[PDB]
Design an enzyme around this catalytic site. Structure first.
Site, PDB file in Angstrom:
ATOM      1  N   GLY A 129       0.751  -1.234   0.000  1.00 34.23           N
ATOM      2  CA  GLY A 129       0.000   0.000   0.000  1.00 34.23           C
ATOM      3  C   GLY A 129       0.774   1.271   0.000  1.00 34.23           C
ATOM      4  O   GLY A 129       0.253   2.340   0.349  1.00 34.23           O
ATOM      5  N   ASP A 237      -5.533   9.707   2.543  1.00 33.55           N
ATOM      6  CA  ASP A 237      -4.625  10.648   1.881  1.00 33.55           C
ATOM      7  C   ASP A 237      -5.330  11.325   0.729  1.00 33.55           C
ATOM      8  O   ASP A 237      -4.807  11.359  -0.374  1.00 33.55           O
ATOM      9  CB  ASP A 237      -3.365   9.905   1.391  1.00 33.55           C
ATOM     10  CG  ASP A 237      -2.387   9.597   2.477  1.00 33.55           C
ATOM     11  OD1 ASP A 237      -2.583   9.929   3.658  1.00 33.55           O
ATOM     12  OD2 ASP A 237      -1.339   9.055   2.125  1.00 33.55           O
ATOM     13  N   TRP A 331      -3.014  -1.360  10.282  1.00 31.13           N
ATOM     14  CA  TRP A 331      -2.106  -1.050   9.164  1.00 31.13           C
ATOM     15  C   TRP A 331      -0.796  -0.529   9.773  1.00 31.13           C
ATOM     16  O   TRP A 331      -0.684   0.641  10.130  1.00 31.13           O
ATOM     17  CB  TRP A 331      -2.778   0.015   8.270  1.00 31.13           C
ATOM     18  CG  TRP A 331      -2.012   0.506   7.039  1.00 31.13           C
ATOM     19  CD1 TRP A 331      -0.681   0.852   6.958  1.00 31.13           C
ATOM     20  CD2 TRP A 331      -2.565   0.801   5.731  1.00 31.13           C
ATOM     21  NE1 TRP A 331      -0.378   1.258   5.670  1.00 31.13           N
ATOM     22  CE2 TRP A 331      -1.505   1.246   4.907  1.00 31.13           C
ATOM     23  CE3 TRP A 331      -3.833   0.674   5.165  1.00 31.13           C
ATOM     24  CZ2 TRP A 331      -1.672   1.587   3.569  1.00 31.13           C
ATOM     25  CZ3 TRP A 331      -4.003   1.046   3.778  1.00 31.13           C
ATOM     26  CH2 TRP A 331      -2.929   1.477   3.031  1.00 31.13           C
ATOM     27  N   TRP A 332       0.173  -1.407   9.908  1.00 29.65           N
ATOM     28  CA  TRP A 332       1.476  -1.021  10.578  1.00 29.65           C
ATOM     29  C   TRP A 332       2.501  -0.488   9.561  1.00 29.65           C
ATOM     30  O   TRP A 332       2.914  -1.190   8.643  1.00 29.65           O
ATOM     31  CB  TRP A 332       2.066  -2.199  11.356  1.00 29.65           C
ATOM     32  CG  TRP A 332       3.203  -1.763  12.236  1.00 29.65           C
ATOM     33  CD1 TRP A 332       3.219  -0.691  13.066  1.00 29.65           C
ATOM     34  CD2 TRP A 332       4.485  -2.365  12.320  1.00 29.65           C
ATOM     35  NE1 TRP A 332       4.437  -0.584  13.676  1.00 29.65           N
ATOM     36  CE2 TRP A 332       5.215  -1.647  13.272  1.00 29.65           C
ATOM     37  CE3 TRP A 332       5.050  -3.486  11.746  1.00 29.65           C
ATOM     38  CZ2 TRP A 332       6.502  -1.978  13.619  1.00 29.65           C
ATOM     39  CZ3 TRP A 332       6.315  -3.845  12.099  1.00 29.65           C
ATOM     40  CH2 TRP A 332       7.042  -3.092  13.037  1.00 29.65           C
ATOM     41  N   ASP A 338       8.772   4.833   2.036  1.00 28.12           N
ATOM     42  CA  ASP A 338       8.378   5.704   0.931  1.00 28.12           C
ATOM     43  C   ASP A 338       8.458   7.159   1.196  1.00 28.12           C
ATOM     44  O   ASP A 338       8.284   7.941   0.296  1.00 28.12           O
ATOM     45  CB  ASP A 338       6.984   5.303   0.364  1.00 28.12           C
ATOM     46  CG  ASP A 338       5.849   5.518   1.316  1.00 28.12           C
ATOM     47  OD1 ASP A 338       6.036   6.182   2.358  1.00 28.12           O
ATOM     48  OD2 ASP A 338       4.716   4.986   1.006  1.00 28.12           O
ATOM     49  N   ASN A 366       2.769  -2.603   6.094  1.00 25.82           N
ATOM     50  CA  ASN A 366       3.091  -1.871   4.832  1.00 25.82           C
ATOM     51  C   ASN A 366       4.657  -1.862   4.658  1.00 25.82           C
ATOM     52  O   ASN A 366       5.348  -1.311   5.516  1.00 25.82           O
ATOM     53  CB  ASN A 366       2.553  -0.470   4.936  1.00 25.82           C
ATOM     54  CG  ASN A 366       2.533   0.272   3.633  1.00 25.82           C
ATOM     55  OD1 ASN A 366       2.556  -0.302   2.523  1.00 25.82           O
ATOM     56  ND2 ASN A 366       2.523   1.573   3.753  1.00 25.82           N
TER      57      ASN A 366
HETATM   58  N1  LIG Z   1      -3.420   4.471   5.280  1.00 20.73           N
HETATM   59  C1  LIG Z   1      -2.130   5.035   4.937  1.00 20.73           C
HETATM   60  N2  LIG Z   1      -1.808   5.617   3.757  1.00 20.73           N
HETATM   61  C2  LIG Z   1      -0.415   6.034   3.479  1.00 20.73           C
HETATM   62  C3  LIG Z   1       0.412   4.911   2.823  1.00 20.73           C
HETATM   63  O1  LIG Z   1       0.060   4.612   1.462  1.00 20.73           O
HETATM   64  C4  LIG Z   1       1.903   5.280   2.941  1.00 20.73           C
HETATM   65  O2  LIG Z   1       2.654   4.218   2.405  1.00 20.73           O
HETATM   66  C5  LIG Z   1       2.259   5.433   4.460  1.00 20.73           C
HETATM   67  C6  LIG Z   1       3.780   5.696   4.679  1.00 20.73           C
HETATM   68  O3  LIG Z   1       4.063   6.927   4.024  1.00 20.73           O
HETATM   69  O4  LIG Z   1       1.503   6.497   5.005  1.00 20.73           O
HETATM   70  C7  LIG Z   1       0.097   6.394   4.926  1.00 20.73           C
HETATM   71  S1  LIG Z   1      -0.716   5.118   5.914  1.00 20.73           S
END
Ligand SMILES: NC1=N[C@@H]2[C@@H](O)[C@H](O)[C@@H](CO)O[C@@H]2S1
Length: 644
Positions: A129, A237, A331-332, A338, A366
């Site tokens: 993700g 996001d 969601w860890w 990234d 993740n």
């Molecule tokens: N639910 C989340 N969406 C984003 C992810 O796609 C990113 O990989 C993560 C780390 O930047 O932050 C947030 S955690």
């Protein structure tokens, strides 16, 4: 080691040979996926040793029905001189018995054991993700097999930069080539007892109308035709109308009522909220309570903890669970890199409360865009989510490494030990690194700076470290056992070797027998700094955190500060003006930085090493496009962009 470790194990120090001749009971009634693993290990007759395999309810395992734990994905496993027992509470349980059994088998021999086992957390695995280059098809194939071996039952497919996942092409079916790949993924997922969860990320441009709702359901239907049996909707996001929690909840319930509860065979249905961690939630707003009240009870709600990047605490998970009225699906965000794309995060998994299994529906990691490299953490997360009460941070890290690269395990540990921290970042998340040598480092540098005598042993520890780092780098570079892993890490491995060579030369400077020797060590160090700058400018030139940083928390700072300290002492002693700076900068001027085609001062006059066409300047106390004007000098954030 068994990984994950079972809930209950009883060992006897007899061992048995695996039976040359044997009688397989329950082969036709048991999970075909588990029978296939078993048959591979045996590679049989009426006479000879009994192996009983099957699920609770099958004739094969009637004798053992009270030993089989009454837990989804549970199993009973037993080895003695007379018989082997491999009995799951359900079909997934039987496969897992087999995965445990495979780890016992050693040089055609087995320990006498009895295991009762089951997971503490219902959903365990990986969400692909992240932002950045999505995993390759081959990488994904490798991953799904790895999840089966480690009892991970969940893979959530959701790469932010897959245009058929996110906006605007979430509305379009995958093209034929990608669809056929997804189809093979699902099939391989099914064989390894993993739920392929396909996610969609429609929120940035979704209209709350029939047209968009039907397109979403039509896309889920196409995925269903491809074999997908679990689904997710991600609202993370994004901004604007798509963050409406009433609408989100209504959409999810519609998917649930008209699609999930209507197909014969759908498994998970999961959503990721907009307010997905406490720092992004409005405690005084209605967002999470609206989700927790309205969302149908079988729908899972994701959460990353108190911050975008955080470890999961009892207090933290209580806070969310009371608002969403169900156990959060975690969601860890580790080892995801990234937002620190110049670092590899190869350290152990730790920091999550090991007593809170009942308070979570699921736990997914993740990972980094580096798929093979992520397996260190994936293996560890599998161990933690399965048996958190017995979770051993360090032993599991070592077991992961030895699993992934048995031909060069000590070398991979060496490399990984010093590639663990993130360095400074906007999410405020850090990991320990280089802990074994840190105190010797700290003492060495304290003594030296003050003009007190350093300890010999601390000098030797530092030397031994640098030597071992060179051995590890060169051996990993040439390793052909996991080539995809070596391709991922190679730039870092180059930079790591340079770091070590620099350390060695800097230590030779401290020893510093005469003026001529010192100067030769000094020039060598300068050339190694330049070499490190070349890697950092040419490798991994992504738009966000370009380049290659390694051993950043302890080792590089030690080397740098030591280098600066001896150069100063030399200048005092010999009235010299040797340059004390530690990073190579070909331009001149607060150190300058070079990022892709930008030349920044670190937050009156810059001289570039050549003439370039200038593109723009962006000062901040606010810009000016330079129309390709030739540029060498600039005079007055503070960023110059050039063509290069
Ligand atoms: N639910 C989340 N969406 C984003 C992810 O796609 C990113 O990989 C993560 C780390 O930047 O932050 C947030 S955690």
């Amino acid at each position: 080691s068994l990984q994950p470790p079972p809930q209950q194990l009883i060992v006897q120090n007899k061992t048995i040979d695996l039976p040359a001749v044997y009688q397989l009971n329950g082969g036709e009634e048991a999970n075909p996926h588990a029978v296939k693993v078993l048959k591979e290990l045996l590679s049989s007759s009426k006479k000879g040793m009994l192996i009983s395999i099957g699920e609770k309810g099958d004739k094969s395992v009637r004798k053992y029905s009270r030993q089989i734990p009454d837990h989804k994905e549970g199993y009973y496993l037993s080895v003695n001189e007379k018989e082997i027992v491999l009995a799951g509470n359900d079909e997934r349980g039987t496969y897992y018995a087999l995965q445990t059994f495979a780890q016992l088998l050693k040089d055609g021999k087995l320990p006498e054991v009895e295991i009762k086992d089951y997971p503490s957390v219902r959903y365990r695995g990986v969400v692909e993700g992240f932002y950045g280059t999505p995993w390759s098809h081959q990488a994904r194939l490798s991953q799904l097999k790895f999840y089966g071996k480690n009892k991970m039952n969940t893979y959530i497919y959701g790469p932010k930069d897959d245009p058929y996942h996110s906006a605007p092409n979430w509305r379009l079916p995958y093209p034929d080539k990608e669809a056929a790949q997804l189809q093979e993924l699902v099939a391989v997922a099914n064989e390894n007892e993993v739920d392929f969860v396909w996610a969609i990320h429609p929120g940035q441009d979704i209209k709350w109308n029939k047209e968009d709702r039907d397109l979403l359901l039509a896309k889920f239907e196409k995925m269903y035709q491809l074999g997908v049996r679990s689904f997710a909707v991600f609202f993370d996001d994004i901004s604007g109308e798509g963050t409406n929690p009433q609408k989100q909840a209504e959409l999810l319930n519609y998917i649930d009522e008209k699609f999930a509860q209507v197909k014969p065979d759908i498994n998970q249905l999961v959503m990721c909220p907009t307010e997905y961690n406490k720092s992004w939630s409005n405690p005084n707003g209605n967002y999470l309570t609206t989700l927790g009240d309205k969302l149908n009870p079988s729908i899972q709600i994701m959460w990353t903890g108190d911050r975008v990047i955080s470890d999961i605490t009892r207090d933290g998970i209580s806070w969310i669970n009371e608002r969403i009225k169900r156990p959060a699906y975690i969601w860890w965000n580790f080892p995801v890199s990234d937002y620190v794309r110049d670092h590899l995060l190869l350290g152990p998994v730790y920091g999550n409360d090991t007593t809170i299994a009942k308070e979570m529906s699921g736990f997914v990691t993740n990972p980094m865009e580096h798929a093979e490299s992520s397996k260190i953490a994936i293996y560890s997360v599998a161990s933690y989510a399965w048996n958190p009460a017995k979770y051993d941070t360090w032993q599991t890290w070592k077991d992961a490494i030895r699993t992934i690269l048995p031909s060069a395990a000590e070398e991979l540990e060496c490399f990984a030990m010093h590639n663990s921290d993130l360095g400074p970042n906007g999410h405020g998340y850090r990991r320990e690194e280089s802990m074994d040598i840190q105190p010797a480092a700290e003492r060495f540098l304290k003594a030296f700076k003050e003009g007190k005598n350093y300890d010999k042993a601390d000098f030797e520890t530092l030397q031994y470290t640098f030597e071992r780092m060179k051995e590890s780098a060169d051996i990993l570079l040439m390793n052909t056992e996991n080539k995809p892993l070596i391709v991922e890490i190679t730039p870092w491995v180059h930079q790591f070797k340079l770091t070590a060579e620099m350390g060695e030369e800097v230590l030779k400077m401290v020893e510093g027998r005469n003026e001529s020797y010192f100067l030769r060590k000094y020039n060598h160090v300068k050339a190694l700094q330049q070499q490190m700058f070349y890697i950092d400018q040419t490798s991994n030139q992504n738009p966000y955190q370009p380049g290659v940083k390694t051993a950043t928390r302890v080792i590089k700072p030690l080397i740098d500060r030591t280098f600066a300290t001896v150069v100063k002492f030399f200048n005092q002693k010999f009235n010299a003006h040797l340059d004390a700076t530690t990073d190579y900068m070909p331009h001149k001027m607060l150190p300058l930085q070079v990022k892709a085609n930008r030349v920044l001062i670190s937050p009156v006059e810059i001289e570039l090493d050549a003439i370039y066409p200038g593109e723009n300047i962006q000062i901040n106390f606010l810009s000016a496009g330079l129309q390709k004007a030739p540029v060498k000098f600039v005079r007055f954030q503070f960023v110059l962009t050039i063509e290069k």
